[PDB]
Amino acid sequence: YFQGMITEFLLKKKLEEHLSHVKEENTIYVTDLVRCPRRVRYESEYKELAISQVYAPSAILGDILHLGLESVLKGNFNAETEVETLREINVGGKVYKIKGRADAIIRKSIVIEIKTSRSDKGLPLIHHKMQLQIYLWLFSAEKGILVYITPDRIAEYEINEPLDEATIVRLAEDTIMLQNSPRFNWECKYCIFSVICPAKLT
Amino acid sequence: YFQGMITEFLLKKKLEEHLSHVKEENTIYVTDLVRCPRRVRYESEYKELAISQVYAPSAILGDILHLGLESVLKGNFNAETEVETLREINVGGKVYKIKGRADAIIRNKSIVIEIKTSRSDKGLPLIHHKMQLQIYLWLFSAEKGILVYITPDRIAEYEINEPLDEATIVRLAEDTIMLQNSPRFNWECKYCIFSVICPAKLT
Amino acid sequence: YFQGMITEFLLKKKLEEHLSHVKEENTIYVTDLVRCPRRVRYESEYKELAISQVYAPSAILGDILHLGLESVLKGNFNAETEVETLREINVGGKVYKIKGRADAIIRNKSIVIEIKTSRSDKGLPLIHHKMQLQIYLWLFSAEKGILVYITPDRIAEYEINEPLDEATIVRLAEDTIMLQNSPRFNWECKYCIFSVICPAKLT
Amino acid sequence: FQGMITEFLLKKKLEEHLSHVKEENTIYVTDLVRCPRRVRYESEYKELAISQVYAPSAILGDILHLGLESVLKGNFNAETEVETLREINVGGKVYKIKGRADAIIRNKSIVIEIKTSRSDKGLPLIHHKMQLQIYLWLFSAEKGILVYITPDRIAEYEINEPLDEATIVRLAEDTIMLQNSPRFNWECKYCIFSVICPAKLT
Amino acid sequence: FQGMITEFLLKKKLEEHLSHVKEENTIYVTDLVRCPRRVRYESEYKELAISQVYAPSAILGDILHLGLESVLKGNFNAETEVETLREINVGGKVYKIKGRADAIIRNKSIVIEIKTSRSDKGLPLIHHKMQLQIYLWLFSAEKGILVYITPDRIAEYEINEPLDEATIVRLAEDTIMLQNSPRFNWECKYCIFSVICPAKLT
Amino acid sequence: YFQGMITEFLLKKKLEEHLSHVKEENTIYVTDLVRCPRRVRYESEYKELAISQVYAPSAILGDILHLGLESVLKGNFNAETEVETLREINVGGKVYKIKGRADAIIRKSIVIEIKTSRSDKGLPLIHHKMQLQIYLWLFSAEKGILVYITPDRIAEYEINEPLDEATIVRLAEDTIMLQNSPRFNWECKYCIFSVICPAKLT
Amino acid sequence: YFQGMITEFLLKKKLEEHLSHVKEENTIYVTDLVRCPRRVRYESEYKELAISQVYAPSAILGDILHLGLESVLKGNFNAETEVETLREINVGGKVYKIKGRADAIIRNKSIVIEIKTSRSDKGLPLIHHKMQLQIYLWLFSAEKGILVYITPDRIAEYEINEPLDEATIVRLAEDTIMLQNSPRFNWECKYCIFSVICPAKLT
Amino acid sequence: YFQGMITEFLLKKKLEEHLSHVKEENTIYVTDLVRCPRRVRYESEYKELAISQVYAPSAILGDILHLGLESVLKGNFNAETEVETLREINVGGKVYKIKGRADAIIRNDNGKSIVIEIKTSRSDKGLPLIHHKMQLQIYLWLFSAEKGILVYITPDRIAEYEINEPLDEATIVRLAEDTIMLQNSPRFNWECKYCIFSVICPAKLT
Amino acid sequence: YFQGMITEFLLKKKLEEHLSHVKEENTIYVTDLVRCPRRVRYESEYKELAISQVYAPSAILGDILHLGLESVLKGNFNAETEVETLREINVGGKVYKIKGRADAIIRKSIVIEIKTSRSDKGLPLIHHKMQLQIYLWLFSAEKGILVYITPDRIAEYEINEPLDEATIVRLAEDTIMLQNSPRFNWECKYCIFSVICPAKLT
Amino acid sequence: FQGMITEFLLKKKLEEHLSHVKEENTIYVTDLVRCPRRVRYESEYKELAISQVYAPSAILGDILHLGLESVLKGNFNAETEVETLREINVGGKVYKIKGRADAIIRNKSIVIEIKTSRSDKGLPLIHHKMQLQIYLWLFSAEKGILVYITPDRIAEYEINEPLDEATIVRLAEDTIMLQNSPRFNWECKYCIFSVICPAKLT
Ligand code: SF4
Ligand code: SF4
Ligand SMILES: [Mn+2]
Ligand SMILES: [Mn+2]
Ligand SMILES: [Mn+2]
Ligand SMILES: [Mn+2]
Ligand SMILES: [Mn+2]
């Protein structure tokens, strides 16, 4: 192929996967709760532009790697991979659904979140920890492992404290009400919506 | 858990896999033909030091990506993966076995696929990776080859369809056996675990 | 307003003008002719990714300038703006159409006006801009063109009068068709949105 | 010699300068957020002030206002380049606070100011905000929009609170009374009067 | 407002600039050692050209000649500010090469040029020498004295060979046909026409 | 000889020396009490990786220096070299042996600890001092000497106060229960387990 | 012709002007209340060395520019130039005279003009300059003063209208006489010609 | 012990060793042949200053390493250590005794003598250094040995080189002539920087 | 001449003068009082290494200067040069004699200390000030002059307050008990015993 | 006020300098090795040249020849400050090449020249060497010693080849005609007459 046969295939499967998930009206993904609110909303308001995230090479790397590593978790830890669930909360009155997909779960029960930075500075990153903390709440699990596979180091962290629904709720209204953007100062640097976004840190 | 439940396991398996590859006396790996001769012989003389390679996180990351990208190939292109073959050559007046292991092979005619990962997409494709693949095309008598890099800055795929001819494999082999030009590439010494005892280290 | 009443509308109108470029087969636009062949092909093959060029602020800005300076050229030089034509050439065996849209043509005798913005006034006139206009001379059978730069550090105008010969246009069209000379200019890969998947990317 | 297109742009731009001739007691809204000494110098050294006509970023900004303004007319039902004025007492004397709004949309009303900047640092710039808050008073609008078209980014801000009449008076006091020059530390770097000005920041 | 002294110096400087009336067919000596495109801009965009009047290094230079010229008149018995023109033939058409010498001494005469620079680097600079050598042929003089007063050093050079009338032709030609612009590669950096000039070195 | 006749021998004797020291379950080395508790536990959980330490050239230099300076001591100060001893302590009500080996002991006894660094910066280093102070406790010796042989300086320090047994017990607790890792901020930088350790300083 | 016709003369006349003034006993000049006390004493003790100040091209440029600007001041403002005067002050129960020479004075009441020339327009107006003029306002009992700079980057005029109070002048005078706090300004030693023998040089 | 017990003893023993070796008017050490001639003569003419080189901590470090590594060599390889020997050379019809002391010798390893020279430095840059190899090659002539090993123990690297060609006698005579006639000083460019005689030497590179 | 006729003689002469300083028993020079006490002690325990100081070229230059300048002080100020004297003090129970040698003295009495340096920075240097304040006490002089001949500056300083015994005694204390080592933090950088000294500052 | 010793030294240097009147057809040897214009300037601008007297470099250099020269009279039985002249023939006229040797040793005769410098870089400097080569001719001596006393090193050089008469005359030729200024490119950087000289290098 002019792109290359393997390249063409991975890009084609990754686009179909990205197109796969239409988000319901009142559903908030776990991953959205720990990202910039404007970014989340842009993903919904500017889907055509949002599609370019499919062609991010570190994303493709990360997916192949979750696939690699998830195989071994199935076959030695008897784990469930890519496990979805919902759980409701009420926000300013309205009922919102919080939707998450865990990289792996083990059945007490263990949630496993796999990450791959290109750098091992500062591990574990607060936003990766929060995410996992929220999945603990989501799946009502007692134990969490956050495991980083980076070129400079492999490191694994036990995270066992779930986030309190009270803060989950307040992370939620911050997402719905676009209250504080960006969520972390580093987000704008890599954000594809910074070309049009008024809130962009400069 | 001291090291971690997950990483304890990956380390255990990777140590196991490393110890499982025993090399015969007159056998040269394809990967040996495109790297420093002294390094190849140190890996045979100082195996207890060579074990330290098992723990290089880039190798662990690299092994997990092969496992992922290999399962996608097996699933959607009807590829065999981790395929071994041997082939004999005469070097000097003596028979050696060249052994290789393809990351994946596809039966259309056959296509040898070599997966590569790195932190950098600089200089792609690297000459020593292309040689590796060109040698596998002779080893497997295969018609076509794909070298595909998965790196954080770029996914890049190259088509290598020309095999190295046997006389040049023989000459690569001669270097290997007789320690002729060490290192093979000037960048190697910097990452070599043997540089600390090696007189030919570039400085 | 989430994005903002005015910006919402500009991005909406620019998305639609983008999506309305139904590309007919055997048709090569002048602006494709002077860019990297693989990039043109990437644009036809990964349209979902290519749409992201819609949101380039330099393109929105450049368009607005074009509109700005275009209203003036209509009402004072009596020119036609956004003027589409096409012309057939014989490339190898096959017959291809070269299509173009001049920014402005004043008639008197014809003059083709190409307007450019840029962040920098360094190196004016740029050789790809020049080439593009020299191709528009041939395409509209004009004998005079003007390249005008509106930059923050300078306003500069250039009289470009020699059209490109058909043989050079043909030689360029080959490269587009058979993916040769990628990239055309070494600076291109730096700003190419396909650099993340292209194996020919300069590094 | 100079070039057909640009010889025209410069001619046409000189005439638009030479046409507006500021009466004795007129202050432009743009003068209230500039350096008072610079305002005064433009009045006192009009042969030198002419040199501003040929700033290439002014020509660019003017071409952009044109293109964009014609889009505001065509699709938003807006009036472009809307002149108005308002008189005020600054210590017994009557001053004309004159202003030209880039565009207005009357249905009950919205002032839009368009800006072109070489970069997107610091958006919205406070002098630009203030200028817009002056126009809301000037044109008695309840709403304004500040829109930036820069090579790095497009962004848009909703400014809804007009400046107090008193504050505008104080601004005019500082303007005629030459009180705090420059108004901002970046001004002198670009000012054509720095070669004769004693207040120049070094 | 500007201050009592500077007002006067500038009004007088301005008025001396608007006085210089350039006849159709006349090229200045100083124009022969400058960028052909630059002297043309000066007649085509006079309103912009007026900003040179406010170049502080020019004011300072003037003030210098003023101070120095009592010395020249009293003790050297020279005429200062000596205007003259001469006729050359270029392209069959015939031109007036006109010049103003800082100071002349008739005895066998010696023309003298005075320069200020912030810097004594490279003295004498080649376009100053070239200038003196055109005043030598203009005034048909046998001796020239170029003298620099810089803050780093005072320096004086004897230029006693004039340019050949033949040479002067190629340079008046350059100036009319706008051939080699800019004449010296350092000109564009300081040129007030660089903002609209397509030949600007960049 | 591929490696070299002399080097092959040194690396064979180092490796066999390193393989000879197997640790019993309730035994802590004196060197362990002044190092990172995690690193200590890595050296016993990842013995195959730990073996790479045998090939650190600075260790080989160090050992040969010890051997040389050990021989001088023996033949002119009637010292015993490489003296091992063992003393028992109570931790969490359990019995551990602290085991150590002094480079040399003289005659009233003096424990000598020899160090070689490639730099004389900051001597004596706190962790080297503690080691020695522990050997005083261990050998119930009354004097300690810490001598550094570096390429920039020879420096000798008299250290005669032992660490009390309670400090030793505290150090042993940290070691058993991985309390504070790394013990010293500079450790991670040179630790062969950094590549798999979650506590690595970054 | 060795040195040059013009410069030879300029140097000759500058030298004479230097030797033309000899300082009175119990007299302090204003120019000296604003300079380092040791330097002022050095100028009496080491007149042969002090004479090198004559050849300082900055001073030459400086004198010429005072001449030209003065010429304009006296034929258009009807200014008096180089106006000498004195006042008496008590210091140490002893009587001293402060003397000075205003560059120009102009009427309306009197305006003291001080002219300055500097290489750079940095930090205008420099505090010591301002100080000099304030002392002249007290000396001439003038109520209004103009400091005017002619630099290559900029022309800048300042109205200074407060005179220094008499106590302060006395203090400046005490320092001058008792050599108390030298240098007066930290930047002085860098240019002082006596830095080579001065114990107090800042270093 | 104000200086310290161990330090005091090493310094005392090293000054003794240095002072034990008085050099005769017609001998040339091997070590001299690969050094600056002016410096070698300075070591005879300014012996009081020369003595400061005793207190160079790299040299004390260096000698302890030789001691310790040498003791390995006497055990497992049956080497002699610090082996002194002498060989004569003609230079302008004057006869000269070239004298050297090899760090270790293996007299008979399968019908071969091996001279071993041990070296230490703080960096492994550029190994092996040409003046080290020359020194080993002169010993090879001195002992008439067939094999040479130059081994570097450095903090970055251990590295061993097999050097088997001895310098011709003519080359050694050329080295000797320069030593005697003070011909080309310094011998190597990096010398003066470390040379304790640079403070009085006119040939010092700047 | 291998070394050279003149330098040979100079070094010969310098070595002789260095060697001819027989150090009496309970004796501390003034020049030792102002330096690190360990350095003083090293100079007494390692005579052979201290001899290298004889070949410091700045000390040779130093001595040639003192000679030349001292010839002027006899000649035109009728002063005694290289004047020697001592004076007992009492240190905590014992009796030591402080001994000094002043560069020049003029008889009331003026002690002159002459100093060179390649740099005039920070003059006068406190340790030179201290040396001379001690001379005034040793010689019962009332006035002192410190004169620096340096390539950038000649500078002379009047020092008229001598140190009292209490402080001199306290300085001798340090010299005896090896306290306050080094006295000044720049000393180790130049000290030839830093190669063996444990208190070297690093 | 300036200091007792300092005053005397500067007072004496001044007198010394002021003594030396150069007669009409004379050229010092030290003038043959210098810029011709500087030698000329020292004649035509005497007042300025007196500033050379206050060079601290030179005062140090003087005090230094005094010390060393008193060793030279007293151990090598030499003549310090030996003055002589020799007539040469240039352009028909007869000139007196005077010179003063720092010292001479009379056995068969040796000229000694002492130099000071704050740097030992590049010894021996070519122009110090020429100076001694001309002195060998002047005194017709067979041997010469150039000796430097710098603070980094003492270094002695033996110079025996006396300079040619023909090229001595070619030097005087340029001294007279101002043929090549400066002689050496480093000269202008320390020249007191660079402030008024048109030859100065920049
Ligand atoms: S050097 Fe500094 S202190 Fe000494 S006189 Fe000149 S200015 Fe005053
Ligand atoms: S090193 Fe520092 S401390 Fe040790 S002696 Fe020399 S100076 Fe005193
Ligand atoms: Mn994950
Ligand atoms: Mn265009
Ligand atoms: Mn030890
Ligand atoms: Mn003035
Ligand atoms: Mn002294």
Question: What domains, with CATH codes, occur in chain E?
Answer: 1-202 (3.90.320.10)
Give the length of chain G: 203
Q: Give yes or no for residue I193 CB within 6 A of ligand 2.
A: yes
Task: Give the amino acid at B203.
Answer: T
- For residue G42, give how far its alpha carbon lies from the nearest alpha carbon of chain I (Å): 14
CA distances from H100 to H83, H162, H165 (A): 8, 20, 18
Total residues belonging to chain A: 202
CA distances from E166 to A148, E79, E100, E174, G173 (A): 81, 29, 21, 13, 68
Compute, in angstroms, the gap from residue I199 CA to the centroid of ligand 2. Answer: 6
End-to-end CA distance of chain D: 39
Say how many CA atoms lie within 13 Å of H55 toward its Cβ.
25
Phi, psi for residue H182 in degrees, rounded to 5: 50, 50
Residue with tokens 């003794």: H16
Q: In 10 A of CB J116, how many CB atoms?
A: 21
Q: Judge contact between J33 and J132, C-beta under 8 A.
A: no
- D·G CB contacts under 8 A: 22
Contacts of H199 in chain I (CB under 8 A): 55-57
In chain B, what is the straight-line distance between the N-terminal and C-terminal CA atoms, in Å?
42
Beta strands in D51-142 (DSSP E): 79-90, 93-106, 109-115
Put simply, the answer to whether G3 touches J55 (Cβ < 8 Å) is no
Please provide residue J162's backbone torsions phi and psi, each rounded to the nearest 5 degrees: -75, 150
Phi and psi of I31, rounded to 5°? -55, -25
Tally of residues, chain B: 203
Query: Using CB atoms and an 8 Å cut-off, which of residues 131-190 of chain B contact chain A?
Result: 146, 148, 150-155, 157-159
CA–CA gap between residue I38 and residue I200 (Å, rounded):
10
Q: Which atom of ligand 1 is nearest to the CA of G42?
A: 5
Q: Angle, to 10 degrees, between the axis of helix E4-19 and the axis of helix G57-74? A: 80
Which backbone phi and psi does D72 adopt, to 5 degrees?
A: -60, -35
Q: Is I179 helix (H, G, I), strand (E, B) or coil?
A: coil
Residue C119 at interface with chain E, using a CB cutoff of 8 Å: no
Residue D28 sits at the vertex; the CA angle it makes with D27 and D29, to the nearest 5 degrees, is 115
Q: How far is CA I101 from the centre of its chain?
A: 8
The whole-angstrom separation of Cα E110 and Cα E108 is 7
Question: If you take atom 7 of ligand 2, which residue's CA is the nearest one?
Answer: I188
- Residue where the block lists tokens 């030593």: H179
* DSSP classification of residue J164: P
How far are the Cα atoms of D29, F23, F88, J45 from residue F100, in angstroms, in the given order? Answer: 84, 12, 12, 84
Angle CA(E114)–CA(E119)–CA(E122) in degrees, nearest 5?
A: 85
For residues F43 and F27, give the distance between their C-alpha atoms in angstroms, rounded to a whole number.
14
Protein residues placing their CB within 5 Å of the ion ligand 5: F 103, 114
Asked if residues I138 and I100 have their Cβ atoms less than 8 Å apart, the reply is yes
Distances (CA, A) of C22 to C19, C27, C38, C94: 8, 11, 19, 21
- Residues with Cβ < 8 Å from H121, sequence gap 6 or more? H152, H154
Residues facing D101 on adjacent strands? D82
What stretch of H or E contains G194?
A: none
Distance from the alpha carbon of residue G184 to the mean position of ligand 1, in angstroms: 8
Give the residue whose CA is nearest to atom 7 of ligand 1.
G189
Q: Are F27 and F97 in contact (CB under 8 A)?
A: yes
Instruction: Check if the beta carbon of residue J193 is closer than 8 Å to that of residue J43.
Output: no
Residue H168 host element (H or E): none
Please state, in angstroms and rounded to a whole number, the distance separating the CA atoms of residues C122 and B168.
50
The answer, for A125 touching chain F at a CB cutoff of 8 Å, is no
Beta-carbon separation of F67 and H66 below 8 A: no
G150, G69 Cβ separation under 8 angstroms: yes
Q: What is the DSSP string of G25-93?
A: TTEEEHHHHTS-HHHHHHHHHTHHHHGGGGG-HHHHHHHHHHHHHHHHHHTTS--EEEEEEEEEEESSS
- Contact partners, residue J164, CB within 8 Å, separation at least 6: none
- Contact between D144 and C4 (Cβ < 8 Å): no
C123 Cβ under 8 Å from any chain E Cβ = yes
I32 lines ligand 2 (CB under 6 A): no
Instruction: Tell whether C47 is within 8 A of chain E (Cβ).
Output: no
Q: Are D156 and A197 in contact (CB < 8 Å)?
A: no
What is the experimental method? X-ray
Q: Strand locations in chain E, DSSP E?
A: 26-28, 79-90, 93-106, 109-115, 143-149, 154-159
CB contact under 8 A, E195 and D55: yes
DSSP letter for F124, please.
S
Backbone φ and ψ of D200, nearest 5°: -50, 130
CA distance H159 to chain B (A): 5
Side chain identity at residue F159, one-letter code:
I
User: What is the structure's resolution, reported in angstroms to one decimal?
Assistant: 2.3
Angle at E11 between CA E5 and CA E15, to 5 degrees: 145
Q: What is the CA radius of gyration of chain A?
A: 17
Gap between the Cα atoms of B49 and F51, Å rounded: 7
C-alpha G95/C-alpha G89 separation (Å) is 6
Residue F153 CA to its chain's centroid (Å): 21
Number of H helices, E strands in chain E: 7, 6
Distance to chain I for F123, nearest Cα, Å: 8
**Ligand 1 pocket check for G144: Cβ under 6 Å:** no
CB H58 within 8 Å of CB F53? no
Q: State whether residue J75 sits within 8 Å of chain I by CB.
A: yes
CA distance J80 to chain I (A): 14
Rounded distance between C-alpha atoms, residue J184 and residue B98, angstroms: 71
User: Which tokens belong to J129?
Assistant: 């060497």
Tokens of H167: 């310098």
Identity at G142, one-letter amino acid code: A
Contact of chains G and F by CB distance (3 or more pairs under 8 angstroms) = no
CA dihedral E105, E107, E109, E111 (to 10 degrees): -10
User: Does the C-beta of G184 come closer than 6 Å to ligand 1?
Assistant: no
Contacts of A106 (CB under 8 A, 6+ apart): A73, A77, A78, A79, A80, A112
Residue E29, token pair as written in the block: 């000596």
Q: Cβ of J49 under 8 Å from any chain E Cβ?
A: no
| DSSP letter assigned to residue J141 | -
CA-nearest residue for atom 2, ligand 2, is I188
Ligand 2: which atom is nearest the Cα of residue I194?
A: 1
Residue type, J116: T
* Residue reference for tokens 């490796």: F15
Q: Facing residues of G152 across strands?
A: none
Query: In this structure, are residues G87 and G137 in contact, taking their beta carbons and an 8 Å threshold?
Result: no
Q: Is the CB of G81 under 6 A from ligand 1?
A: no
CA dist., res. H87 & res. J110, Å (int): 44
